[PDB]
Amino acid sequence: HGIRMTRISREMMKELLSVYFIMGSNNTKADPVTVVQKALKGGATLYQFREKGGDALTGEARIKFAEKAQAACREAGVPFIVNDDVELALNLKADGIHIGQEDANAKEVRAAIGDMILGVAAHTMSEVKQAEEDGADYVGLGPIYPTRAVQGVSLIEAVRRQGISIPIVGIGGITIDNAAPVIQAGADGVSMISAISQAEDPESAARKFREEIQTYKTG
Ligand SMILES: Nc1nc(C(F)(F)F)ncc1COP(=O)(O)OP(=O)(O)O
Ligand SMILES: [Mg+2]
């Protein structure tokens, strides 16, 4: 994964969303970077640097943590995605950026990031359709499981029913036990934080997701 000179293809984007690990320093009791390295070693196909909130790093501390996470993604050969922060995404030459409905407008972000990967969080058919024309390469629908209202795989099913094929990754309380339906509903992958970041064995946790997700995408 080098500097993209063209928009990422749906086939390649969908392969990456399979097991999508999201994590910040405050989502685990162990060593942040060490957990990420294990998640990759395990089988995670994409990672998103998400550092914000209460016990979250700031200033230089944050940036360096990001560089280490990105470095670990490099070794594993997995794309490094940044959350919210467009300025940082561009500075670290990250593979992508993810935004929600309250973050910078997708149109602007797309113009500022060139052909970088762009993920947009959607919650309604409208937001999905908008994300697509705004130039998003994929959308994160949810929260599927238990603020924003839980929606199961209803939206995911509505999107596929309208024939829309945009890459989709599910998000929200996803565990190894409830991930299958998300896929069966038509999602191209599942996103998780605690299911892996808080596992006593993150590496094996990521490995289980990898096996399950591949099994269900085939069937
Ligand atoms: N971070 C996210 N990542 C995904 C992804 F698709 F990547 F799985 N989907 C949805 C969200 C939620 O985005 P948002 O509401 O902006 O809040 P926050 O930045 O606090 O997560
Ligand atoms: Mg956000």
From Swiss-Prot:
Q: Name the cofactor(s) required for activity, per the record.
A: Mg(2+)
In this entry, which stretches build a coiled coil? none
Q: What class of enzyme is it?
A: transferase
Q: Can you cite an annotated GO cellular component?
A: cytoplasm
Annotated EC: 2.5.1.3
Membrane-crossing residues?
none
Q: Which UniProt keywords apply?
A: Magnesium, Metal-binding, Thiamine biosynthesis, Transferase
User: What pathway annotation does it carry?
Assistant: Cofactor biosynthesis; thiamine diphosphate biosynthesis; thiamine phosphate from 4-amino-2-methyl-5-diphosphomethylpyrimidine and 4-methyl-5-(2-phosphoethyl)-thiazole: step 1/1
Identify the residues that bind 4-amino-2-methyl-5-(diphosphooxymethyl)pyrimidine: Q48, F49, R50, E51, K52, N83, A121
What drives induction of this protein's expression?
Answer: Is weakly repressed by THZ and not at all by thiamine.
One Pfam family matching this protein:
TMP-TENI
How are cofactors bound according to the entry's free-text note?
Binds 1 Mg(2+) ion per subunit.
Binding of 2-[(2R,5Z)-2-carboxy-4-methylthiazol-5(2H)-ylidene]ethyl phosphate, residues: G173, I193, S194
One GO term of the biological process aspect: thiamine diphosphate biosynthetic process
Q: Where does Mg(2+) bind?
A: D84, D103
Q: List the disulfide bonds.
A: none
**Which Gene Ontology MF annotations are present?**
magnesium ion binding; thiamine-phosphate diphosphorylase activity
- Anything else known: Thiamine phosphate synthase appears to proceed with a dissociative mechanism (SN1 like) in which the pyrimidine pyrophosphate dissociates to give a reactive pyrimidine intermediate which is then trapped by the thiazole moiety.
Q: Which family does it belong to?
A: Belongs to the thiamine-phosphate synthase family.
Q: How does it assemble?
A: Monomer.
Q: What does this protein do?
A: Condenses 4-methyl-5-(beta-hydroxyethyl)thiazole monophosphate (THZ-P) and 2-methyl-4-amino-5-hydroxymethyl pyrimidine pyrophosphate (HMP-PP) to form thiamine monophosphate (TMP). Is also able to use the 2-methoxy analog MeO-HMP-PP, as substrate in vitro, but not the 2-trifluoromethyl analog CF(3)-HMP-PP.
Q: Tell me the PANTHER family matching this sequence.
A: THIAMINE-PHOSPHATE PYROPHOSPHORYLASE (PTHR20857), THIAMINE-PHOSPHATE SYNTHASE (PTHR20857:SF15)
Any idea what this protein is called?
Thiamine-phosphate synthase
